[PDB]
């Protein structure tokens, strides 16, 4: 369970010890970090051979449809499951595994499974979808693997559960949703790519401190398949700089001193703002580079 | 040595046609050289490469440079000149890097079409790496083996050079008319097969006592002509102790070796007779 955003995986050419990190109710709670383990940390779980987190849950083992289970357990003033927190998702999944079945979860869409939404009326802050080529209908279920399988819920599951409880700072960004296949010479084309759109348009450069939080809050809007963030740091003049002829002021390095001499690398933005650099040996990480990623370049 | 600067001049006169004074790695900027010559990174000067010319402001212009010509034969006869150091020109740099006849065995991959990145990731190992050709006879042998293995239509990811490149430019070669595609790279994101592999006979110099780390102290006196002090006899230790008075208590004797191991050669090509 190593999410490829905080660990550099490549041809590896002072001990190392790992740990589990929590980010105060984050959509990626449970990440695995690695550091030197000479320091002092905490240990809580040790492995040997219904109310929950200010919420209430009720499970019924009846085999009924979605509308039918809603009308069934709604008589007791209860609303179907709507996952909005990682701990709630983990508890629902462990309860489903203890019940040994895939139970109902409650939501509905409006326009051809394009705008999904819970029945509570809260802004989307959590996304744990399973696959991209599975969105055949406009409903979802929880599987054994703990993901969100997009299916039709006009069927009979062995049970149900229901619960009770852009211009910004003198710059304009843009998002491109197309399909591309160019996998060569990715260091002398982005400038002329954004310059053809409109004059006075350069690649995204960070000259402030509130733009990071702004783009972070703007990211989790269409993140059904988007999980990584790209940056404009590449091989420039035998160093790790931007594309334009300008020096760097805000360092975006993880730790130590990187010495990447390759023509390109992966400068990634974390979930909370951890500066991350990943040296790549295969080019099979470009999905995720130009098709459904952030290709925003400022105008000023 | 002088062979290195002659090779650099050959490389700068063969690939380049015009004549212009880019720069040469000769510097007499600091006044503390006391007439000698300095350097910047692990380069003890031992050859005569800088002449002397009288000038009204000879002590101001302190960046030496020679001239490269449009002729293929330039054996030291270069125009010497001296300029200042307040210029501003974009980067042009260098960094320290610290059975087929005439070659080792070459592993040719077949029925497995991978790109350049997948090739350099899969075929390379602790002893394996991208096999580069350094000789023309080896290149002819590679061409014959390619023509006898697959044919003239296939393309192979080959690294072309005249010296073995170190791992510490997506070139390809075809069996037919390799003379035109020697240095013409294309988009290497295609699946194709590939191949994969004073004292007696001893003088001393002293410098400013400015302190610095040992990783950087290996290039403090190496700027001048000489190496770090290596004790070979007790007379050398007596000389060191006799020159110690005007120095501090600490001194960089200058030898590096990993812990829990042995010391080897004193990093200056000197055997151990005693310690």
PDB file of N, CA and C in Angstrom, chain B residues 83-129:
ATOM      1  N   UNK B  83      41.636  38.490 -21.146  1.00  0.00           N
ATOM      2  CA  UNK B  83      40.504  39.396 -20.987  1.00  0.00           C
ATOM      3  C   UNK B  83      40.076  39.494 -19.527  1.00  0.00           C
ATOM      4  N   UNK B  84      38.964  40.183 -19.277  1.00  0.00           N
ATOM      5  CA  UNK B  84      38.478  40.428 -17.928  1.00  0.00           C
ATOM      6  C   UNK B  84      37.495  39.330 -17.517  1.00  0.00           C
ATOM      7  N   UNK B  85      36.787  39.548 -16.404  1.00  0.00           N
ATOM      8  CA  UNK B  85      35.874  38.557 -15.850  1.00  0.00           C
ATOM      9  C   UNK B  85      34.488  39.128 -15.562  1.00  0.00           C
ATOM     10  N   UNK B  86      34.148  40.284 -16.123  1.00  0.00           N
ATOM     11  CA  UNK B  86      32.873  40.934 -15.845  1.00  0.00           C
ATOM     12  C   UNK B  86      31.887  40.732 -17.003  1.00  0.00           C
ATOM     13  N   UNK B  87      32.080  39.687 -17.803  1.00  0.00           N
ATOM     14  CA  UNK B  87      31.209  39.422 -18.940  1.00  0.00           C
ATOM     15  C   UNK B  87      29.940  38.712 -18.465  1.00  0.00           C
ATOM     16  N   UNK B  88      29.050  38.386 -19.405  1.00  0.00           N
ATOM     17  CA  UNK B  88      27.775  37.749 -19.071  1.00  0.00           C
ATOM     18  C   UNK B  88      27.334  36.933 -20.285  1.00  0.00           C
ATOM     19  N   UNK B  89      27.600  35.623 -20.251  1.00  0.00           N
ATOM     20  CA  UNK B  89      27.310  34.736 -21.376  1.00  0.00           C
ATOM     21  C   UNK B  89      26.642  33.467 -20.851  1.00  0.00           C
ATOM     22  N   UNK B  90      25.596  32.977 -21.518  1.00  0.00           N
ATOM     23  CA  UNK B  90      24.867  31.801 -21.014  1.00  0.00           C
ATOM     24  C   UNK B  90      25.760  30.571 -20.882  1.00  0.00           C
ATOM     25  N   UNK B  91      25.183  29.528 -20.286  1.00  0.00           N
ATOM     26  CA  UNK B  91      25.962  28.411 -19.762  1.00  0.00           C
ATOM     27  C   UNK B  91      26.641  27.597 -20.862  1.00  0.00           C
ATOM     28  N   UNK B  92      27.896  27.215 -20.597  1.00  0.00           N
ATOM     29  CA  UNK B  92      28.636  26.257 -21.422  1.00  0.00           C
ATOM     30  C   UNK B  92      29.683  25.637 -20.494  1.00  0.00           C
ATOM     31  N   UNK B  93      29.450  24.393 -20.075  1.00  0.00           N
ATOM     32  CA  UNK B  93      30.017  23.915 -18.819  1.00  0.00           C
ATOM     33  C   UNK B  93      30.534  22.489 -18.939  1.00  0.00           C
ATOM     34  N   UNK B  94      31.161  22.029 -17.858  1.00  0.00           N
ATOM     35  CA  UNK B  94      31.615  20.654 -17.724  1.00  0.00           C
ATOM     36  C   UNK B  94      31.693  20.309 -16.244  1.00  0.00           C
ATOM     37  N   UNK B  95      31.478  19.032 -15.935  1.00  0.00           N
ATOM     38  CA  UNK B  95      31.460  18.568 -14.555  1.00  0.00           C
ATOM     39  C   UNK B  95      32.310  17.314 -14.428  1.00  0.00           C
ATOM     40  N   UNK B  96      33.002  17.190 -13.297  1.00  0.00           N
ATOM     41  CA  UNK B  96      33.790  15.995 -13.032  1.00  0.00           C
ATOM     42  C   UNK B  96      32.876  14.791 -12.840  1.00  0.00           C
ATOM     43  N   UNK B  97      33.229  13.681 -13.484  1.00  0.00           N
ATOM     44  CA  UNK B  97      32.444  12.456 -13.429  1.00  0.00           C
ATOM     45  C   UNK B  97      32.800  11.568 -12.241  1.00  0.00           C
ATOM     46  N   UNK B  98      33.677  12.022 -11.352  1.00  0.00           N
ATOM     47  CA  UNK B  98      34.077  11.224 -10.198  1.00  0.00           C
ATOM     48  C   UNK B  98      32.967  11.167  -9.152  1.00  0.00           C
ATOM     49  N   UNK B  99      32.437 -14.566 -29.413  1.00  0.00           N
ATOM     50  CA  UNK B  99      33.044 -13.331 -28.933  1.00  0.00           C
ATOM     51  C   UNK B  99      33.420 -12.416 -30.093  1.00  0.00           C
ATOM     52  N   UNK B 100      32.843 -11.213 -30.103  1.00  0.00           N
ATOM     53  CA  UNK B 100      33.135 -10.250 -31.155  1.00  0.00           C
ATOM     54  C   UNK B 100      34.550  -9.714 -30.978  1.00  0.00           C
ATOM     55  N   UNK B 101      35.289  -9.632 -32.085  1.00  0.00           N
ATOM     56  CA  UNK B 101      36.659  -9.134 -32.043  1.00  0.00           C
ATOM     57  C   UNK B 101      36.656  -7.665 -31.644  1.00  0.00           C
ATOM     58  N   UNK B 102      37.605  -7.290 -30.781  1.00  0.00           N
ATOM     59  CA  UNK B 102      37.728  -5.927 -30.259  1.00  0.00           C
ATOM     60  C   UNK B 102      36.450  -5.504 -29.528  1.00  0.00           C
ATOM     61  N   UNK B 103      36.156  -6.218 -28.457  1.00  0.00           N
ATOM     62  CA  UNK B 103      34.987  -5.935 -27.648  1.00  0.00           C
ATOM     63  C   UNK B 103      34.526  -7.172 -26.909  1.00  0.00           C
ATOM     64  N   UNK B 104      33.588  -6.954 -25.991  1.00  0.00           N
ATOM     65  CA  UNK B 104      33.028  -8.035 -25.190  1.00  0.00           C
ATOM     66  C   UNK B 104      31.850  -8.661 -25.935  1.00  0.00           C
ATOM     67  N   UNK B 105      31.118  -9.546 -25.263  1.00  0.00           N
ATOM     68  CA  UNK B 105      29.953 -10.169 -25.868  1.00  0.00           C
ATOM     69  C   UNK B 105      28.764  -9.211 -25.852  1.00  0.00           C
ATOM     70  N   UNK B 106      28.003  -9.228 -26.943  1.00  0.00           N
ATOM     71  CA  UNK B 106      26.861  -8.341 -27.132  1.00  0.00           C
ATOM     72  C   UNK B 106      25.582  -9.167 -27.121  1.00  0.00           C
ATOM     73  N   UNK B 107      24.693  -8.866 -26.177  1.00  0.00           N
ATOM     74  CA  UNK B 107      23.419  -9.568 -26.047  1.00  0.00           C
ATOM     75  C   UNK B 107      22.382  -8.878 -26.926  1.00  0.00           C
ATOM     76  N   UNK B 108      21.967  -9.552 -27.995  1.00  0.00           N
ATOM     77  CA  UNK B 108      20.954  -9.035 -28.906  1.00  0.00           C
ATOM     78  C   UNK B 108      19.594  -9.576 -28.485  1.00  0.00           C
ATOM     79  N   UNK B 109      18.622  -8.690 -28.282  1.00  0.00           N
ATOM     80  CA  UNK B 109      17.281  -9.108 -27.886  1.00  0.00           C
ATOM     81  C   UNK B 109      16.430  -9.240 -29.143  1.00  0.00           C
ATOM     82  N   UNK B 110      15.678 -10.333 -29.233  1.00  0.00           N
ATOM     83  CA  UNK B 110      14.802 -10.603 -30.362  1.00  0.00           C
ATOM     84  C   UNK B 110      13.428 -11.021 -29.858  1.00  0.00           C
ATOM     85  N   UNK B 111      12.430 -10.865 -30.730  1.00  0.00           N
ATOM     86  CA  UNK B 111      11.032 -11.175 -30.428  1.00  0.00           C
ATOM     87  C   UNK B 111      10.513 -10.402 -29.219  1.00  0.00           C
ATOM     88  N   UNK B 112      11.160  -9.288 -28.879  1.00  0.00           N
ATOM     89  CA  UNK B 112      10.755  -8.449 -27.750  1.00  0.00           C
ATOM     90  C   UNK B 112      11.035  -7.002 -28.144  1.00  0.00           C
ATOM     91  N   UNK B 113      10.007  -6.314 -28.629  1.00  0.00           N
ATOM     92  CA  UNK B 113      10.142  -4.949 -29.124  1.00  0.00           C
ATOM     93  C   UNK B 113       9.834  -3.978 -27.989  1.00  0.00           C
ATOM     94  N   UNK B 114      10.860  -3.268 -27.522  1.00  0.00           N
ATOM     95  CA  UNK B 114      10.722  -2.287 -26.458  1.00  0.00           C
ATOM     96  C   UNK B 114      11.357  -0.973 -26.897  1.00  0.00           C
ATOM     97  N   UNK B 115      10.957   0.108 -26.232  1.00  0.00           N
ATOM     98  CA  UNK B 115      11.474   1.432 -26.552  1.00  0.00           C
ATOM     99  C   UNK B 115      12.832   1.629 -25.877  1.00  0.00           C
ATOM    100  N   UNK B 116      13.361   2.852 -25.952  1.00  0.00           N
ATOM    101  CA  UNK B 116      14.672   3.132 -25.372  1.00  0.00           C
ATOM    102  C   UNK B 116      14.628   3.089 -23.849  1.00  0.00           C
ATOM    103  N   UNK B 117      13.587   3.670 -23.248  1.00  0.00           N
ATOM    104  CA  UNK B 117      13.483   3.693 -21.793  1.00  0.00           C
ATOM    105  C   UNK B 117      13.313   2.285 -21.232  1.00  0.00           C
ATOM    106  N   UNK B 118      12.415   1.498 -21.830  1.00  0.00           N
ATOM    107  CA  UNK B 118      12.227   0.124 -21.377  1.00  0.00           C
ATOM    108  C   UNK B 118      13.497  -0.695 -21.564  1.00  0.00           C
ATOM    109  N   UNK B 119      14.238  -0.438 -22.644  1.00  0.00           N
ATOM    110  CA  UNK B 119      15.494  -1.147 -22.867  1.00  0.00           C
ATOM    111  C   UNK B 119      16.511  -0.816 -21.782  1.00  0.00           C
ATOM    112  N   UNK B 120      16.720   0.478 -21.520  1.00  0.00           N
ATOM    113  CA  UNK B 120      17.718   0.878 -20.532  1.00  0.00           C
ATOM    114  C   UNK B 120      17.282   0.486 -19.124  1.00  0.00           C
ATOM    115  N   UNK B 121      15.982   0.260 -18.912  1.00  0.00           N
ATOM    116  CA  UNK B 121      15.515  -0.187 -17.607  1.00  0.00           C
ATOM    117  C   UNK B 121      15.607  -1.697 -17.431  1.00  0.00           C
ATOM    118  N   UNK B 122      15.389  -2.473 -18.493  1.00  0.00           N
ATOM    119  CA  UNK B 122      15.337  -3.924 -18.382  1.00  0.00           C
ATOM    120  C   UNK B 122      16.695  -4.577 -18.619  1.00  0.00           C
ATOM    121  N   UNK B 123      17.369  -4.235 -19.721  1.00  0.00           N
ATOM    122  CA  UNK B 123      18.597  -4.943 -20.065  1.00  0.00           C
ATOM    123  C   UNK B 123      19.740  -4.580 -19.127  1.00  0.00           C
ATOM    124  N   UNK B 124      19.761  -3.350 -18.623  1.00  0.00           N
ATOM    125  CA  UNK B 124      20.834  -2.922 -17.739  1.00  0.00           C
ATOM    126  C   UNK B 124      20.720  -3.611 -16.385  1.00  0.00           C
ATOM    127  N   UNK B 125      21.867  -3.946 -15.809  1.00  0.00           N
ATOM    128  CA  UNK B 125      21.918  -4.634 -14.525  1.00  0.00           C
ATOM    129  C   UNK B 125      23.180  -4.178 -13.798  1.00  0.00           C
ATOM    130  N   UNK B 126      23.571  -4.922 -12.761  1.00  0.00           N
ATOM    131  CA  UNK B 126      24.780  -4.579 -12.018  1.00  0.00           C
ATOM    132  C   UNK B 126      26.019  -4.646 -12.902  1.00  0.00           C
ATOM    133  N   UNK B 127      26.057  -5.592 -13.843  1.00  0.00           N
ATOM    134  CA  UNK B 127      27.156  -5.706 -14.787  1.00  0.00           C
ATOM    135  C   UNK B 127      26.775  -5.360 -16.218  1.00  0.00           C
ATOM    136  N   UNK B 128      25.486  -5.271 -16.531  1.00  0.00           N
ATOM    137  CA  UNK B 128      25.033  -4.976 -17.880  1.00  0.00           C
ATOM    138  C   UNK B 128      24.682  -3.501 -18.026  1.00  0.00           C
ATOM    139  N   UNK B 129      24.834  -2.996 -19.248  1.00  0.00           N
ATOM    140  CA  UNK B 129      24.472  -1.623 -19.577  1.00  0.00           C
ATOM    141  C   UNK B 129      24.316  -1.525 -21.088  1.00  0.00           C
TER     142      UNK B 129
END
